[PDB]
From Swiss-Prot:
Autoproteolytically processed at the GPS region of the GAIN-B domain; this cleavage modulates receptor activity. Residues 3-253 form the Olfactomedin-like domain. Changing residue 95 to T: Abolishes interaction with FLRT2. It is found in: Cell membrane; Postsynaptic cell membrane; Cell projection, Axon; Cell junction. Residues 118-148 are annotated as: Interaction with FLRT3. Localizes to postsynaptic spines in non-overlapping dendritic domains of CA1-region pyramidal neurons: specifically localizes to excitatory synapses in the S.oriens and S.radiatum, corresponding to distinct presynaptic inputs onto CA1-region pyramidal neurons. This is Adhesion G protein-coupled receptor L3. The gene is Adgrl3. Orphan adhesion G-protein coupled receptor (aGPCR), which mediates synapse specificity. Ligand binding causes a conformation change that triggers signaling via guanine nucleotide-binding proteins (G proteins) and modulates the activity of downstream effectors. ADGRL3 is coupled with different classes of G alpha proteins, such as G(12)/G(13), G(s), G(i) or G(q), depending on the context. Coupling to G(12)/G(13) G proteins, which mediates the activation Rho small GTPases is the most efficient. Changing residue 133 to A: Strongly reduces FLRT3 binding. It comes from Mus musculus. Changing residue 47 to T: Strongly reduces FLRT2 binding. Belongs to the G-protein coupled receptor 2 family. LN-TM7 subfamily.
Length: 254
């Protein structure tokens, strides 16, 4: 139902919402619902198992939550998405995605992402990245991971949010270790790298074709940031070194 905005060509911060008391975390809306609801999950290393819900941006900024959800498992890293009333997250130190129904507060499904690497981060690196990242876009729900079969390079799969069937899988050429964030727009994978920071690689799943690109991120962006795209409003939902902000996006023709 969402029309593709085009090929991403620019990124800039467009709203500062508040400074959180947690350095890292993730936040997002449910793009499949016409709703002001906001979902918020601060990252506490190896202890993350609650989701907070706010009814509006005003309530969010003011710190007036509606409710909290106690998740049935702990979450790996910062990642989660909400898609048509269901929460999806990577179960801590597994290659599993959990589906949790928010309305009834119970787990409705799990899917093992075949061959996905997990619990394999070098001792030295910041542990806030999820082994399997989730992303929502115009085309549906996505998992972004790596496999040994693809030499630690990023693999993309489309996941049906209702049946949990894998609908397609693509091997990219990009080493997952080199990425700070990855997100989908119109079925195209954008990968953010350190240089400053920029998108330097895209993978178009419709075409099964990748390219090198150069889209600078703001200087204030850090590696430890969490970034999620929203296809309903075409914004990036960002959590960056305590700061809860949105980025706006400029597009050119596909
Ligand atoms: Mg994300």
């Amino acid at each position: 139902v969402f029309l593709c905005p085009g090929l991403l060509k620019g990124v800039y911060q467009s709203e500062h919402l508040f400074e959180s008391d947690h350095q890292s975390g993730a936040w997002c809306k449910d793009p499949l619902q016409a709703s002001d609801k906001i979902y918020y999950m601060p990252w506490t290393p190896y202890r993350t198992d609650t989701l907070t819900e706010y009814s509006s941006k005003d309530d969010f900024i003011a710190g007036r939550p509606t409710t909290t959800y106690k998740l049935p498992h702990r979450v790996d890293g910062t990642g989660f998405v909400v898609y048509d009333g269901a929460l999806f997250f990577n179960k801590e130190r597994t290659r599993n995605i959990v589906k949790f129904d928010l309305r009834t507060r119970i787990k409705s499904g799990e899917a093992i992402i075949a061959n996905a690497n997990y619990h394999d981060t070098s001792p030295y690196r910041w542990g806030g990245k999820s082994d399997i990242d989730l992303a929502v876009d115009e085309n549906g729900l996505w998992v972004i991971y790596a496999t040994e079969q693809n030499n630690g390079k990023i693999v993309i799969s489309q996941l049906n949010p209702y049946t949990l069937r894998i609908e397609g899988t693509w091997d990219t050429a990009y080493d997952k270790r080199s990425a700070s964030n990855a997100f989908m727009i119109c079925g195209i994978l954008y990968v953010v790298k350190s240089v400053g920071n920029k998108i330097d690689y895209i993978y178009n799943t419709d075409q099964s074709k990748d390219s090198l690109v150069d889209v600078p991120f703001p200087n204030s962006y850090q590696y430890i940031a969490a970034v999620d795209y929203n296809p309903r409003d075409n914004l990036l939902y960002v959590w960056n070194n305590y700061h809860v902000v949105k980025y706006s996006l400029d597009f050119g023709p596909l």
